[PDB]
Write a structure and sequence with these properties.
This is part of a larger assembly, with two copies of chain A. By secondary structure, the first copy, chain A, is an alpha/beta fold. Chain A has helices spanning 2-10, 42-51, 87-93, 98-104, 128-134, 172-179, 194-203, 219-224, 254-268, 290-299, 342-345, 376-383, 397-405, 410-417, and strands spanning 31-32, 39-40, 73-75, 84-86, 161-166, 184-190, 209-211, 230-234, 279-285, 305-308, 318-323, 351-352, 365-366, 371-372. In chain A, β13 (365-366) and β14 form a beta hairpin. Chain A starts with a helix and ends in a 10-residue tail after the last helix. In chain A, α6 (172-179) crosses α14 (410-417). In chain A, strands 7-6-5-8-9-11-10 form a seven-stranded mixed sheet, with helices on both faces. In chain A, 36% of the residues are buried. The complex binds S-adenosyl-L-homocysteine (2 copies) and zinc ion (6 copies). The site of one zinc ion has 7 residues of chain B, from α2. One zinc ion (ZN) binds next to α3 of chain A. Chain A: It comes from Homo sapiens.
Chain lengths: 427, 428
């Protein structure tokens, strides 16, 4: 209402659109809106951090793109686009009679996909992917000191790495370390789900010393299992995401388990004065709470780096990485082995309409004039796992897909773990 | 139903009552029931930990005493007794025709207060307060190593104590340290509520250095504010208790703030090899979750000690204390200054119906001039062992000031806990 009055005042050329927050009509303009023209208040920044990468079961966005709220949204008909524009924002930026006439338009493209690009009150700002990448470096509200850079040990003095992996899953971290050719002295890995235990047991040939519950693990265990050189882990993102229909809480269950990672990180950290190279990685999903993200950034004492897997793989897997691994910030490079098109990951006899899959038009494959799910071995190919990685035991397809989806993106974790070759021995 | 068939088999003398779990009828009998005769399964132990000290707005118990569940409970008419027995348990242990006839009895006592104390299928075990005290030493499910005992520093080498207090409130901890006569070098205190800030500012004469929110305190702040010798804290129990009608969550809000205490504890802890005496106390309420209590015990790496203030003061203020303060286990001694009766804590011209008041239709506890009346604010200060007129600082309402008093630690309990710190730090 106040939004709409302010945009009415703007169309008279009495107020600049860049001096007003186009999301909620707030005068407290600190930022500029990254995609479109207007200002941006800080409450709308927190709402934009929480809500922008939230998608319904549909596959399309949970809320509007402009204000991250709205009442009734307008879904885009363009292929591979999932954006939604609520009716209240289109009443402003396009006009109060053009939303109703644009609903009647059956092939309707949204304004991020509009072939023309320019409109009367709304124009699309040009370097919007660059500003979307800079928008997460814009999160300087949590200001910290940079992670301590340790000087590289000489190549003759390097030793095999020792990894404490919490929330191991299907042993993605050890698989990536072997893919880099780093010698692994030992790989301690706590995990509870039997199927993921079994995947790692078979695929890594009994090298992994499997552990009980993380909460059961104490500091004495951490001391007696040798000094650790790399401590990795990722919080469960089954309840933390908006994709699960059963969102009874947000940081019941999953948050607890984060604090378990926090405690065993301190337990594995060498003392001050012990200048031996130690490293740690935490992972979480982007569709998360702001105060959640703050509390995580404060406890781990570090700024999160967002890394989307689209730059290197065929999925849309945007994940926050806290850590002190050198070159965590540096831009991602996709090797020729990595498949950037979904069609390359498909089996033979199958053709994909999509170029990317949003796993967080339900079934993404046209085969034999019929709509079908990605097969399990294809999902393995999509994240960059080796072929037939999860065919170990006699488990169902629904469970095995669910076992694959939770996992870290393999070229992303390769990109992250790659400078550790400078610090430890090679095969 | 099954448990009712089980009790039927017990009254035929085919099964012992001590081989069955009288709460829910489970055959997995690990423990014995502490108050009455029968076994006790572990799930019922967890339900007993959570539910036993939960009281309604009535003042009486939230659930049945026997099974911690039940459907419709029977409240006890005896004075100062707040127990409830659900109809389904009395169908067994007294008989299926005696519950109905015992409702009709208008002066009805319960079976922990029964003059006879010996009924047909239900008898009362004799050393039940001893077994209630031992029942919290029976919580060895969370087994840990004992807290490290540091050897005492000589009396000529002692220095004034430095306290980092989180969730200070009305500065109970510094007041108790001054009551003991310990020299305090500095008292940093984080606190958000203005009224509790103000109480501390006036009652402790600007000595307290006040911080903003606990979530704004970094490790850099902990390093630059001097080494700390004693870190204390207590989580909010407004939402965590069952007394608040608005229980939307359990460890939303309050749970966070616990971890803030956890982090700043690690930030204030000296390194390994730095053998200087460092101490810490955390406090929480007893009407809490089991897995909650587990997670807290695991993070703080210690076994809780339940301490009820009834042993030293006029309230029932049963609280868990985690810590490494020496003699945290040892039994409580009530000095002659402490008032064990409620009547002594009353003003003149007022006479109490109760001997103890616990506040987390006899809702108002005082019979004055043929009329029922709340405890006055200065009396609530006397009940917890605060000095007289402790909270009369600023122009604040009575409801707010009572609410400001009720959250606070019990002063002779905290005196009992802090007392061996005199052996480690300087005196006035
Ligand atoms: N208490 C607990 N201890 C260990 N693992 C747990 C756990 N609770 C859940 N998990 C498991 O931890 C995972 C959360 S996220 C797993 C991602 C992992 N990096 C991978 O690539 O597979 C799930 O597999 C979940 O089943
Ligand atoms: N984030 C926060 N930082 C500091 N204090 C807080 C807080 N949230 C709540 N509090 C306060 O902490 C107290 C919780 S319990 C206070 C008991 C205290 N030992 C005493 O004797 O007063 C309440 O006074 C509450 O208002
Ligand atoms: Zn706004
Ligand atoms: Zn909108
Ligand atoms: Zn579009
Ligand atoms: Zn039972
Ligand atoms: Zn009962
Ligand atoms: Zn009674």
């Amino acid at each position: 209402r106040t939004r709409e009055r302010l945009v009415y005042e703007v169309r008279q050329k009495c107020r600049n659109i860049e001096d007003i927050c186009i999301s909620c009509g707030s005068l407290n303009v600190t930022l500029e809106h990254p995609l479109f023209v207007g200002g941006m208040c800080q409450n709308c920044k927190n709402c934009f951090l929480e809500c922008a990468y939230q998608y319904d079961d549909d596959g399309y966005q949970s809320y509007c793109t402009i204000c991250c709220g709205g009442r009734e949204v307008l879904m885009c008909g363009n292929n591979n686009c999932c954006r939604c524009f609520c009716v209240e924002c289109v009443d402003l930026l396009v006009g109060p009679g053009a939303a109703q006439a644009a609903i009647k338009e059956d092939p309707w493209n949204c304004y991020m996909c509009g072939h023309k690009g320019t409109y009367g009150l709304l124009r699309r700002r040009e370097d919007w992917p660059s500003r979307l990448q800079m928008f997460f470096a814009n999160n300087h509200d949590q200001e910290f000191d940079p992670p301590k850079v340790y000087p590289p040990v000489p190549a003759e003095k390097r030793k095999p790495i020792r990894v404490l992996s919490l929330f191991d899953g299907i042993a993605t971290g050890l698989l990536v370390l072997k893919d880099l050719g780093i010698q692994v002295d030992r790989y301690i890995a706590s995990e509870v789900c039997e199927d993921s235990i079994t995947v790692g047991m078979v695929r890594h040939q009994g090298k992994i010393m499997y552990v009980g519950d993380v909460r059961s693990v104490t500091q004495k265990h951490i001391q007696e299992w040798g000094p650790f050189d790399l401590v990795i882990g990722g919080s469960p993102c089954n309840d933390l995401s908006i994709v699960n229909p059963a969102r009874k809480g947000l940081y019941e269950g999953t948050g607890r388990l984060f604090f378990e990672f926090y405690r065993l990180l301190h337990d594995a950290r060498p003392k001050e004065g012990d200048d031996r190279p130690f490293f740690w990685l935490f992972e979480n999903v982007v569709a998360m709470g702001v105060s959640d993200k703050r509390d995580i950034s404060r406890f781990l004492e570090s700024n999160p780096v967002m890394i989307d897997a689209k730059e290197v793989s065929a999925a849309h897997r945007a994940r926050y990485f806290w850590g002190n691994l050198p070159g965590m910030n540096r831009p991602l490079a996709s090797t020729v082995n990595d498949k950037l098109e979904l069609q390359e990951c498909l089996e033979h006899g199958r053709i994909a309409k999509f170029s990317k899959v949003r796993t967080i038009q339900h079934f993404p494959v046209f085969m034999n004039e019929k709509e079908d799910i990605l097969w399990c071995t294809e999902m393995e190919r999509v994240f960059g796992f080796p072929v037939h990685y999860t065919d170990v035991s006699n488990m169902s397809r629904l469970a095995r897909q669910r076992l694959l989806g939770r996992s870290w993106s393999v070229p992303v974790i390769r990109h992250l773990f790659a400078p550790l070759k400078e610090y430890f021995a090679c095969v």
